[PDB]
Amino acid sequence: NEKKYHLQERVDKVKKKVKDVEEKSKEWVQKVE
């Protein structure tokens, strides 16, 4: 039942993609206000 998962070298990189996509939102609060 390991085959199913084996999300170690894909489900790792994606964790550092939400931080990236959460940096271009900070710049929005600064411009609208």
PDB file of C-alpha atoms in Angstrom:
ATOM      1  CA  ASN A   1       0.000   0.000   0.000  1.00  0.00           C
ATOM      2  CA  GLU A   2       3.059   2.220  -0.323  1.00  0.00           C
ATOM      3  CA  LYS A   3       2.710   2.642  -4.082  1.00  0.00           C
ATOM      4  CA  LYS A   4      -0.461   4.664  -3.608  1.00  0.00           C
ATOM      5  CA  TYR A   5       1.292   7.362  -1.647  1.00  0.00           C
ATOM      6  CA  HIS A   6       5.017   7.787  -2.343  1.00  0.00           C
ATOM      7  CA  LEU A   7       4.384  11.529  -2.213  1.00  0.00           C
ATOM      8  CA  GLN A   8       7.717  12.533  -0.730  1.00  0.00           C
ATOM      9  CA  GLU A   9       9.375  14.159  -3.741  1.00  0.00           C
ATOM     10  CA  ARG A  10       6.293  16.003  -4.968  1.00  0.00           C
ATOM     11  CA  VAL A  11       4.310  16.773  -1.841  1.00  0.00           C
ATOM     12  CA  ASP A  12       7.399  18.504  -0.434  1.00  0.00           C
ATOM     13  CA  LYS A  13       8.125  21.069  -3.119  1.00  0.00           C
ATOM     14  CA  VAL A  14       4.482  22.147  -3.121  1.00  0.00           C
ATOM     15  CA  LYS A  15       4.818  23.288   0.491  1.00  0.00           C
ATOM     16  CA  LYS A  16       7.196  26.025  -0.618  1.00  0.00           C
ATOM     17  CA  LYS A  17       4.724  27.196  -3.259  1.00  0.00           C
ATOM     18  CA  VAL A  18       2.049  28.567  -0.915  1.00  0.00           C
ATOM     19  CA  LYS A  19       4.556  30.922   0.671  1.00  0.00           C
ATOM     20  CA  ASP A  20       5.421  32.241  -2.763  1.00  0.00           C
ATOM     21  CA  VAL A  21       1.766  32.643  -3.634  1.00  0.00           C
ATOM     22  CA  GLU A  22       1.314  34.363  -0.270  1.00  0.00           C
ATOM     23  CA  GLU A  23       3.912  37.071  -0.881  1.00  0.00           C
ATOM     24  CA  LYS A  24       2.166  38.637  -3.853  1.00  0.00           C
ATOM     25  CA  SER A  25      -0.846  39.272  -1.614  1.00  0.00           C
ATOM     26  CA  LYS A  26       0.961  41.412   0.954  1.00  0.00           C
ATOM     27  CA  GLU A  27       1.691  43.955  -1.760  1.00  0.00           C
ATOM     28  CA  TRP A  28      -2.063  44.286  -2.284  1.00  0.00           C
ATOM     29  CA  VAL A  29      -2.898  45.631   1.165  1.00  0.00           C
ATOM     30  CA  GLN A  30      -0.326  48.343   0.681  1.00  0.00           C
ATOM     31  CA  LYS A  31      -1.759  49.624  -2.582  1.00  0.00           C
ATOM     32  CA  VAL A  32      -5.514  49.619  -1.988  1.00  0.00           C
ATOM     33  CA  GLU A  33      -5.225  51.350   1.342  1.00  0.00           C
TER      34      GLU A  33
END
